Amino acid sequence: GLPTMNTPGSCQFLTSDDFQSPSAMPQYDVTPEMRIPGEVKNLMEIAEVDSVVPVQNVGE
Amino acid sequence: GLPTMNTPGSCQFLTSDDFQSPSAMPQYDVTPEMRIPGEVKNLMEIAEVDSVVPVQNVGEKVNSMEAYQIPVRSNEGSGTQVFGFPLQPGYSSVFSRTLLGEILNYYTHWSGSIKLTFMFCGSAMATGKFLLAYSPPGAGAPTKRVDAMLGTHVVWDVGLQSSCVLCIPWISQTHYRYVTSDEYTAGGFITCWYQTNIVVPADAQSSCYIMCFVSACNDFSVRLLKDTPFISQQNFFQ
Amino acid sequence: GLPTMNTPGSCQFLTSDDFQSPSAMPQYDVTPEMRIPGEVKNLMEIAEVDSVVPVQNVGE
Amino acid sequence: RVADTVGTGPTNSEAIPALTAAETGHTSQVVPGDTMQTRHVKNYHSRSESTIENFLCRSACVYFTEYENSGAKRYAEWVLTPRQAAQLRRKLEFFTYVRFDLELTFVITSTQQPSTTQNQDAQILTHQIMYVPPGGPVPDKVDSYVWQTSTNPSVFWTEGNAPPRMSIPFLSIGNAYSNFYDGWSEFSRNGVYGINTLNNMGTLYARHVNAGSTGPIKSTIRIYFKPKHVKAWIPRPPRLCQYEKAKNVNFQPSGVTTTRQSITTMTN
Amino acid sequence: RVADTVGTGPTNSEAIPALTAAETGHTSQVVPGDTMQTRHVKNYHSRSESTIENFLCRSACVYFTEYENSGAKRYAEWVLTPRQAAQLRRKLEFFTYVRFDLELTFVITSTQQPSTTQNQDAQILTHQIMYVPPGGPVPDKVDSYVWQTSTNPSVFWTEGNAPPRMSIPFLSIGNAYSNFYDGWSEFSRNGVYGINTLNNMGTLYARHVNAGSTGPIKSTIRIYFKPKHVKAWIPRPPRLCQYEKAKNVNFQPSGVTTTRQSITTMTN
Amino acid sequence: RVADTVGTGPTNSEAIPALTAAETGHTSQVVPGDTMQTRHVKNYHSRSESTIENFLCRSACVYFTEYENSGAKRYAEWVLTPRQAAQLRRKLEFFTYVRFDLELTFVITSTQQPSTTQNQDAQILTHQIMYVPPGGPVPDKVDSYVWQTSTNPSVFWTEGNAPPRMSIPFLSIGNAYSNFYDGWSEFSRNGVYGINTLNNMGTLYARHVNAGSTGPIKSTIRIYFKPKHVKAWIPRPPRLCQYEKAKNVNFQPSGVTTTRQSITTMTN
Amino acid sequence: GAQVSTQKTGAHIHYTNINYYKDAASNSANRQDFTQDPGKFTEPVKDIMIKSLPALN
Amino acid sequence: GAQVSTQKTGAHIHYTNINYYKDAASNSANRQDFTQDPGKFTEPVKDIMIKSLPALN
Amino acid sequence: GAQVSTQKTGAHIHYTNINYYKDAASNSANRQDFTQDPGKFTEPVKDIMIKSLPALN
Amino acid sequence: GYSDRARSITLGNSTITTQECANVVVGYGVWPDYLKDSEATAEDQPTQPDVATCRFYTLDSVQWQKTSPGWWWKLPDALSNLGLFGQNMQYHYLGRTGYTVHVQCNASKFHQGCLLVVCVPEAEMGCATLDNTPSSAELLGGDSAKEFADKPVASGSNKLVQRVVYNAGMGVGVGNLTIFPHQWINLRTNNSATIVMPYTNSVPMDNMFRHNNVTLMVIPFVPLDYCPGSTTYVPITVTIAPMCAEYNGLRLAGHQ
Amino acid sequence: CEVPTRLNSASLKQPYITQNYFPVGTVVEYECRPGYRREPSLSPKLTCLQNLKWSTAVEFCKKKSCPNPGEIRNGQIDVPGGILFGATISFSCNTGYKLFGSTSSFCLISGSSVQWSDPLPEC
Ligand SMILES: CCCCCCCCCCCCCCCC(=O)O
Ligand SMILES: CCCCCCCCCCCCCCCC(=O)O
Ligand SMILES: CCCCCCCCCCCCCCCC(=O)O
């Protein structure tokens, strides 16, 4: 027994956390990745493309 | 006290985990291992051995040895059909009970090539010629020899060798196919046709039988583990 | 807080386990060991000595 | 880190950075210094909260179902899908193909249903959650033989502890998960049309391992998805309408935006 | 990793890879390239979920029994066997001889039995599970002297925590466990025939250490086996029939497979 | 590791390994090869589960007592001894003098005693266990001043957690613990005869720190001993009779063994 | 086999990480992959279009 | 005495492990033993049968 | 100051141990002391008795 | 310059010439050998007759009719009363022996059929009645063959053995029996089958009388057929040769 | 032994349903319920074991198949759940053709076999 001490925040679920968890399917062989065109590594790449602006949003 | 913090997933039992636990019998002297013949280090080694295929599972023939015999004969025609079944190694009634199908029914996905070996068990005086064909999906099963000719076929000549091997290759659009029935992961159709005829001499039986053996090639693989749908139980066996 | 995760088998008592525990009498001076004749380091040493066999265990 | 501004001065040249041609379908790469005089600014701003992984890596409730310890409804069953809810579905349909590992969390909460039974005294409830891949023997009852979970993964959770959680691999026969599918399941162009063709992820079951008390208790299980290690391709425009069915992309037509008083009005 | 395909072209030779002789009892080692033209494919597929250890290393419920805190049934007793259930038994009888360590888990759940007793107020229940090897003094009652567990291994578990679990060694006088035995226990060829000859693994007992409440509570214990470090020899065909008795291999005769409309029918 | 057998052949010599003289009180060191022809066998068998430490290092219940939260019996008191139970006592009396550290565990379980009191609602019970060495002020009541434990070691345990456990040193004025004593306490050869002369290990007390509820609850404490780092000397024959009193070695005379039909009968 | 990396700090510090599971589909999500390439979607024209130059010539 | 090994990763990363118990029948199950040998069951004939050659000659 | 020792394995692997308390009467029990000496109890005669020789001469 | 169709096997004072046979099958890739001094347990010196016990023994023939289901032989109990092999097996307590099985069946170019010869280790057999196990007088008969059945044996109050050929008496598919060392006799190709089997057990030695290591089963998958005018009596003969047999534990004769 | 196990495809024969007493070693027999064909491989018999429990029961009958719905003219048929006993196929017409008749067709049991009671609409 290595003496420890739980700290406030123990046994809680935070939707935005980052921990390792035990796999439910051990040693699963994942199907490899083919090169698919148009990889997105950032949302800002999308925000920099042109988009038509509805200026005349007046009535119908 | 070294300050720690429990994380979600603490104090839970997962049937598929991997941790160390305290022994209930410490320093137990385990009896040594003698060399026993036939060690198995992988399930796929078993799935690669031949297994007789019950093609004629029609009616009462399953309560016999007749489910295993493919009944060819001598007829006044050319181009008729012997048998036919779909490429589902673990779902179709023809394949769901061989060694390969029995191993498959424990796994969600499969991939690789199939071997189908046909052995002629007629007389040594009977001679024949057959067309064994595989047709991938997209059009229905062929209804005539000419339609089947257009797929992947082999012409089997019954000579001194008694066996021929039709190798069904991997022509999937994905990498893996579902063992269970699924239209999206379609496999194809396997058929046999009389290339010529079974010519016998006089005083020799004209009705003969073929036998089919199913094996996996060296590029076969299976994926997610699942429970078999075959075994069942209502109370604890005592 | 170092994030940990309890595993099945936590907070249990097994009569045949091996862990370290906190002493109730810290720094107790244990009386030394004199040489006493007949130390036994194994039960099999006892099982190898002769013992009279009651063969005629018949009746009274 | 975002690009720093470059100081510029006046200009009387033939270079025309402003005038371009949008027909070429090319976005202009103009900076503010081309059209005005600027100063040198060093920007330390970073695009770190804009990575696709960070954007999609947050737990979200995808479904919740209820079961009891008495009566007809003794266990709960859900076919796994990420299209039951609106929020994560819309976040995920920014892209055509995605590929991620999964982190699964469950939040189970019991509640004493009202009853005339007296001398009630409950014990600690224990729940079992089981996963059946396609082709498994689905439970037909609560005291069935399939809850032995010989090969099917299962978790046992006693009430009053940190919520259960496991990690799921890609688990797809395809090289990437598809959020959209333009086609049918049969080669004859009939049957199931759409993304329902590719959804074969299995089924989930939940039950009480014991009854606990002599009084009825209803337990609710909530399922939380978290995508980890995400790879995305082919970005698509966001849903303008409101989702109707998870199985189909059927929608009710809606205006392009909201309206304002006049084309020269600065108030919505 | 599975073998990669080798590209092949046309052929007009005397080599006959297709024609063979099945009588020799030898499986053909033919690849698809022998009978057709192929391309070069590099396969990254792995046979990692096919290892015998991975296949058998999953917890499975082998038995469950119930005891009470009042009345005649105050403790529970089970002679250890892996043949009571169907799933792990069929998974284990793919081989003749196996050899593995064991991981044992228990899931204990109490339940308030209905009673007319009033002012019920329970305290935390504590359970004891004890293992008696062959030749031990078996408990004849709940308040017996043998629950002292001087040398017999025992565990004490209070309700409301992670389930108890210990590790078991091979514990076999034979060099390997036998799933099948063709012979009798007496040299005169009579008596116990079959695998019951070699099952002498001991007995398991479970009880409440306290009564807890003045109202009856029934506790159920479920036992989960997990084989670790498995070595298997002599593979055997899978059970076609349905198991009847754990002690004997007696079976009801069944068809070889299911039937279909015709030998040329592509629908089951 | 046990000695391996040595292969032997036939013999026609004057060496007489079989014939010996038992009068010398010397055990023969003969192997099977002296009296027959043998083969060479390599033995990997080990005598690792035969070490005295491993044999004695297992927890065993030595005593259990009960106290209440109302009435006259509000606390429990035990003078420490390992002779109250049979199993560990017989295991320990294989030797004359032993010397070990101790590992002490307690298992405390409450139980609601039946009462006519209504509206019962209990809170978490907390227990205190205290150790008083010889010469300490023994508690005369439950709300005494000695439960302050200024120097006496004490433990506080709340119900619903892992059982309490501490480590005890040799704590003996003698160089080794004695299991047997042939003599009296007074030099005049009268008074206490036997092993009770050397038992001065102190006293143990247990109580509820709070009452918890308005309804009576009876708590039972069980004490488990585990010898660690054991050194043993002078082996002695095992008890043929059944223990009667912990204080004295008084016994009822019993037969040397069990009887059989005849001196030539192979059935008990 | 511990990995020491840099934390997220403001402009104008290291952390330690160990993997406990043998699956690689169970490790913490990677929150530090700041890499951008808008050439695929923006400016996708076959012929390079220099900014100062007339788009149509 | 820690052991660093490789995790299970896709094609086309290390973990650390320490043993805490003294029995070796209490360690984690070995999930990485990818070794195959079908010669014992398939192709068990005493005389080698080359593929391209006639089985009976 | 960790101690690496060998586990209990079958015939025909290491563990790590650290002590956290300062008493030495609180450490794990020693389960590995395989040492035997039956000379004290068996064969206790003052004069050595060779096996093949006659006990009384 | 020879043909791989002919083959001769010499053991002790016996010799078997096949003339027309398929390649010999060797167990699990292992050839039978003696017990090693690092795997032994019994301390007394073993006996090795070598030539007296390791020779070809020819059991009594059976007849292959058109409707024959199949036959089975428990291998240790078939040679129990034959020659010096049976004698040493009775006196000794422990024995350990490998086998060579040579099944022979010949016919003309106008006869057709197919038999499966399978050596099944630990072939435990079920019972017609679920409550009780099958008797020895039912499971094994030496000096003769035991026959399978084509129809399920009636259940009731008996100690019979379920003999359905498809269930193989072991609740398994007869087609899946090709997991054990197996050879096929095709009347148009073969005339004999040869299988060499090593010693398989969870223990270094065992009592042959109370335990059967392997059971040899011959089953006609494709039936026998011919046209009227040709030979109607076609027998099947089985030859067994104990290999590297040794015994430990010499005592009184008999297995009582 | 208690009342024999209930199945979703088979029901006890006439002597067994009336019987309320089952000693050890008793065999009861099942029969296909309406709309279910019998699988030849499985035998519909259950014995009473010594522990007063029946032997493992597996479904002894399988659902029947209604005939092929055919091909409608100038329209399509969904066939969503397959063509087994208790199915429901839907009918539709192309742009410009009006459906006259029934909209669906359940597979029901008509006499000794299963038939589609609804007729085909014309459009
Ligand atoms: C108690 C253990 C339960 C384990 C349950 C595992 C369920 C796995 C679910 C995988 C969901 C995959 C979602 C893919 C979405 C998509 O197609 O884009
Ligand atoms: C509270 C501690 C309890 C400890 C109980 C230990 C029980 C050990 C059981 C061993 C089961 C071995 C199964 C062997 C199966 C086989 O013969 O193939
Ligand atoms: C809450 C802390 C309580 C601590 C109690 C400590 C009690 C120590 C008991 C020592 C027992 C020694 C037994 C010696 C037996 C012998 O004489 O052989």
Side-chain angles (χ1 to χ4, degrees), chain C residues 24-25, chain F residues 80-83 92 98 100 102 104 106 129-132 153-156 166 168-171 177-179 195 198-199 201 203-204 225:
Chain C
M25 294 86 174
Chain F
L80 296 123
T81 161
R83 297 170 182 91
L92 261 177
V98 280
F100 51 78
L102 203 75
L104 243 185
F106 303 102
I129 311 172
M130 184 187 47
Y131 169 58
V132 182
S154 174
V155 68
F156 287 84
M166 61 285 307
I168 313 298
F170 178 53
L171 220 75
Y177 294 125
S178 304
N179 304 330
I195 190 51
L198 316 188
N199 190 50
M201 299 315 295
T203 301
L204 207 82
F225 275 20

Side-chain angles (χ1 to χ4, degrees), chain B:
Chain B
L2 161 70
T4 78
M5 193 197 67
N6 290 355
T7 64
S10 300
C11 294
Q12 75 174 354
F13 169 47
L14 179 62
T15 71
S16 33
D17 60 4
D18 216 17
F19 308 120
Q20 336 188 17
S21 45
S23 205
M25 294 86 174
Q27 310 299 323
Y28 175 81
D29 188 21
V30 179
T31 312
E33 1 182 356
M34 57 177 299
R35 290 182 176 94
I36 309 179
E39 46 174 358
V40 220
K41 301 295 299 301
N42 206 270
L43 276 196
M44 292 302 312
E45 303 174 4
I46 307 172
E48 285 177 349
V49 319
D50 280 345
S51 183
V52 202
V53 191
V55 183
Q56 206 190 353
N57 54 348
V58 190
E60 216 65 37
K61 262 63 180 309
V62 283
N63 302 303
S64 315
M65 280 181 295
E66 285 180 293
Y68 295 105
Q69 313 162 347
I70 299 168
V72 298
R73 60 176 287 183
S74 167
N75 36 29
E76 297 272 0
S78 200
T80 38
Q81 194 183 3
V82 180
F83 63 81
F85 44 81
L87 175 66
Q88 320 185 60
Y91 176 80
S92 56
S93 59
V94 188
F95 283 123
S96 86
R97 282 312 201 159
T98 56
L99 286 159
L100 184 57
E102 292 279 50
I103 292 190
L104 287 214
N105 276 277
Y106 276 101
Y107 294 98
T108 313
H109 314 96
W110 70 277
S111 194
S113 290
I114 293 293
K115 273 194 296 262
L116 279 186
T117 305
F118 308 93
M119 185 169 66
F120 198 75
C121 319
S123 320
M125 300 299 301
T127 60
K129 249 153 183 185
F130 298 97
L131 194 94
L132 317 149
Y134 166 58
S135 86
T143 63
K144 28 193 172 305
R145 192 180 63 188
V146 282
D147 285 8
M149 165 248 303
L150 306 164
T152 301
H153 61 284
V154 182
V155 178
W156 178 21
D157 184 31
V158 176
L160 212 71
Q161 318 295 312
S162 64
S163 305
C164 187
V165 182
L166 168 71
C167 193
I168 283 85
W170 192 244
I171 322 192
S172 202
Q173 62 174 32
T174 65
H175 280 231
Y176 277 81
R177 271 176 188 163
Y178 288 100
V179 172
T180 184
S181 174
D182 179 34
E183 302 179 0
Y184 172 78
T185 53
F189 317 98
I190 303 168
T191 44
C192 193
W193 310 78
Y194 284 92
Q195 181 70 2
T196 62
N197 204 358
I198 285 194
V199 170
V200 297
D203 277 307
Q205 280 290 343
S206 54
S207 310
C208 302
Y209 301 106
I210 321 180
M211 269 202 300
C212 182
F213 309 98
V214 62
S215 163
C217 284
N218 61 4
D219 53 318
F220 206 95
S221 203
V222 294
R223 211 155 52 177
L224 185 61
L225 253 165
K226 68 182 192 65
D227 283 348
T228 181
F230 298 129
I231 216 60
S232 63
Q233 180 191 34
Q234 267 90 12
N235 300 287
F236 277 123
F237 310 128
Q238 294 173 183

Side-chain angles (χ1 to χ4, degrees), chain F residues 171-193:
Chain F
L171 220 75
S172 175
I173 57 178
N175 291 315
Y177 294 125
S178 304
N179 304 330
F180 301 91
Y181 185 62
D182 203 23
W184 302 258
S185 65
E186 315 213 289
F187 306 85
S188 57
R189 282 202 189 119
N190 42 17
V192 165
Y193 171 77

Side-chain angles (χ1 to χ4, degrees), chain E residues 119 121 149-151 156 210, chain F residues 58-59 87 110 112 118 224:
Chain E
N119 312 317
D121 205 59
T149 72
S150 184
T151 320
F156 287 84
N210 52 330
Chain F
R58 268 190 182 185
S59 302
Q87 292 192 356
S110 304
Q112 181 192 353
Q118 300 296 323
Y224 290 88

